[PDB]
Design an enzyme around this catalytic site. Structure first.
Site: not given
Ligand SMILES: [Mg+2]
Ligand SMILES: [Zn+2]
Ligand SMILES: [Zn+2]
Ligand SMILES: [Mg+2]
Ligand SMILES: [Zn+2]
Ligand SMILES: [Zn+2]
Lengths: 444, 444
Positions: B46, B97, B148, B150, B161, B317, B322-323, B326, B364-365, B407
């Site tokens: 992620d 996501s 979440d 994903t 979501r 995953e 990702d987290k 951030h 994912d991004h 992102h």
């Molecule tokens: Mg995710």
């Molecule tokens: Zn993501």
């Molecule tokens: Zn994110």
């Protein structure tokens, strides 16, 4: 191995955004050739990472669009480009143009700022010097001043990229200065290199007169003439060139410094995405009708060079992508990525027609520009833009508080088409590129 | 195809930095198989763009190093992952996501926030629902809460979501609310979906009670059990499981919310690279040896799932890359990438031994983190880290003034190994992946 990668239909409907029509396995299998390459065209978009390719594509062709040249190379992979610390000989994670250019044209890592020399400042031969020995015709074109690092790395062995001409070299690369017994400044080494087609900007430094040798006292421009170089400085004159070889080398100087950027637009600003309206790039009014585009020089070069039966090596570079990225100016940058796409289409067209041509499109290192959310409140420089989709795209520049945005170390895309292009797939190094060319061309 | 892409030797010497040991052509031609794949393992990092991979490789393995898992997939390409503006249906360049996950599992673009439905809010089946219907065994592992986006996108059709359990769906997705004749919240739909193996975190949401239907009044955990689900909450109890099918599906809840990250390190700060010393990451003292690693869940999942001769579909995953990205925390972010690499090694090993498995590693991004010069003076957050090379590496986060880094929209790496892997090469779209898995599994 498909030619068309645009979204296939309505992007809001199931499977409407697919770039693939069928199965690539067969097509790809048929793209894999390890037969020899007669020619090699290396297009370098200075500072053109995946971020830069996506932003320019979104703007110019729409998210679901596809660069007819840039995104049309079948075999792809990611490549590393870290430099070395001159002292410790340990990796420097963020390379500059000189150190990266030196790796793909020489095959040895070096420190940031070195041209054609390893960290011991020992010089090694470049792929252009090798093609020239094997009998091949050589070309070197760029939209930057010829003394700049990317094109210079192909013909010069200098310990500092700042050693452009006679005066600069004296103080910054004295061991290289002709007088102290060195090979000379970048400009003089280019003049000695004698590739068949050399096109770009940087006429300013040719106004420097040499300090030693045969042409001492005479400007470097005069020396070039007094050596057989055909000198062209605009579109019409380049066009008239009927041939270029070791007896009639071509030297084009289309600008004092760097050639003019294609598009005009304003510089990104603090909260520019939320304080200022969306911008729409426009043609650069100050670019005189007679300055050749990258695709034109690439076209003309390929023509003259293709007249050689042994084959040719040509390096083309879209220089101002990097420079405008430093300037935090979205439009100039995207315009320069669009310009380079045009050159790649010209490159590919000949390739598919010729059949023994290996074409490679990549970049020297990654850069600062980031595509972010329209409502992003960033600490750096931002700007909203009106893409081809009728939507807004915000660009961000946040890795420097100086007047220049910084290079970045992320691995980036390398794509190829032609015999020996499989050596570009997967993870490779910037140095492999050198060996890939040496092998394809049989310059071993 | 090469399973060893680390630098050859002395990176300071010619040919030493190279990753290629030879011409890839023939090795690469023999990896191109279009025969059906029996199984598919899709690993998602992620927010793991090319930048995140490089920084983690420089830190953990050294610049010239090589992830024995992440970097070993032979066929590579880059893919676009833009979302859609719900209103206008025009592209939205930076996806979240939920809309990206929906794209690869469903094959249709959607707005940010949407799980399993198109911009019209029409439900579309996911690849897991298709595999399940074809008789294939199914798995879904992640280190984030199972609700979440994903993991959720694979078993849930929700308009936001945010609709995790009964209470948030009533108010945030009332057209999905069980009480209103809706299919149910994310957790309730996960429990209905009934994949053979489901592992992750997010147990707290299971404490909510159903507001309607057959198990109304009973918490979601009770409904799980009542429906024949085996529940495991730690490393030990997971280890002791021997089967998992439609008769006795497995459900692992290892954390209240997200599973804890592996490494501890300070948060990047303003001028952190100049004002604060260089950091060396350490193990996160908060993670219990009771909590299984992503590699462990992956391995166990493959063992249980592999007992189905007909095949299996599995999605793994490494969520917190990702987290932590951030959170502007280089150490936590790299630890999660190192962790995802162990998982890819488990995947690959199995795949080479089985021979009919398609393994795919992507993200994912793209995200915020950038690798920049050690001397850099940036407007955002920065931090210096001591890498394996014994050199310093600075990472910058500068696309947000808020407490969370955004992102980014840059196309990113997609790599694959196995049958139908050639469909990952070149430029493609996130939706193409949905179609690539459907045709590989013959799930058509
Ligand atoms: Mg995710
Ligand atoms: Zn993501
Ligand atoms: Zn994110
Ligand atoms: Mg350059
Ligand atoms: Zn550069
Ligand atoms: Zn630069």
């Amino acid at each position: 191995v498909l030619e068309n990668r645009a979204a296939q239909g309505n992007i809001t409907a199931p499977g409407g955004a697919r770039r693939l029509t069928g199965d690539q396995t067969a097509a790809l299998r048929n793209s894999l050739s390890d037969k020899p390459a007669k020619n090699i065209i290396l297009l370098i978009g200075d500072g053109m990472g995946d971020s830069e390719i996506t932003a320019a594509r979104n703007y110019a062709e729409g998210a679901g669009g596809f660069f007819k040249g840039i995104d049309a190379l079948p075999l792809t992979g990611q490549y590393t480009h870290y430099a070395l610390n001159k002292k410790t000989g340990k990796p420097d994670y963020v390379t500059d143009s000189a150190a990266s250019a030196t790796a793909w044209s020489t095959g040895v890592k070096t420190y940031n700022g070195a041209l054609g020399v390893d960290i011991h400042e020992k010089d090694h031969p470049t792929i252009l010097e090798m093609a020239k020995a094997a009998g091949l015709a050589t070309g070197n074109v760029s939209t930057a001043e010829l003394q700049d690092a990317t094109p210079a790395a192909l013909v010069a062995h200098v310990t500092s990229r700042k050693c452009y001409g006679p005066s600069a070299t004296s103080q910054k690369c004295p061991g290289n200065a002709l007088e102290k017994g060195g090979k000379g400044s970048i400009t003089e080494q280019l003049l000695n290199a004698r590739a068949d087609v050399t096109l770009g900007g940087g006429a300013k430094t040719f106004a420097e007169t040499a300090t030693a040798g045969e042409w001492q006292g005479k400007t470097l421009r005069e020396e070039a003439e007094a050596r057989g170089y055909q000198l062209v400085s605009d579109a019409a004159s380049l066009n008239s060139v009927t041939e270029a070889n070791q007896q009639k080398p071509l030297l084009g100087l289309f600008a004092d410094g760097n050639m003019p950027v294609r598009w005009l637009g304003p510089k990104a600003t603090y909260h520019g995405n939320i304080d200022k309206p969306a911008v729409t790039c426009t043609p650069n009014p100050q670019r005189n009708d007679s300055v050749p585009t990258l695709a034109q020089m690439t076209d003309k070069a390929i023509e003259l060079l293709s007249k050689n039966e042994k084959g040719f090596f040509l390096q083309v570079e879209g220089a101002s992508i990097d420079k405008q990225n430093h300037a935090a100016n979205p439009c100039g940058q995207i315009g320069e990525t669009v310009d380079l796409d045009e050159a790649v289409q010209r490159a590919l067209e000949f390739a598919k027609k010729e059949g023994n041509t290996l074409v490679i499109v990549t970049a020297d290192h990654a850069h600062a520009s980031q595509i972010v959310a329209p409502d992003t409140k960033a600490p750096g420089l931002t700007q909203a833009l009106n893409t081809k989709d009728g939507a807004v795209m915000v660009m961000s520049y946040g890795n420097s508080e100086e007047d220049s945005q910084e290079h970045t170390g992320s691995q980036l895309r390398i794509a190829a088409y032609g015999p020996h292009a499989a050596n570009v797939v997967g993870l490779t190094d910037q140095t492999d590129l050198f060996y890939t060319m040496k092998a394809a061309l049989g310059l071993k």
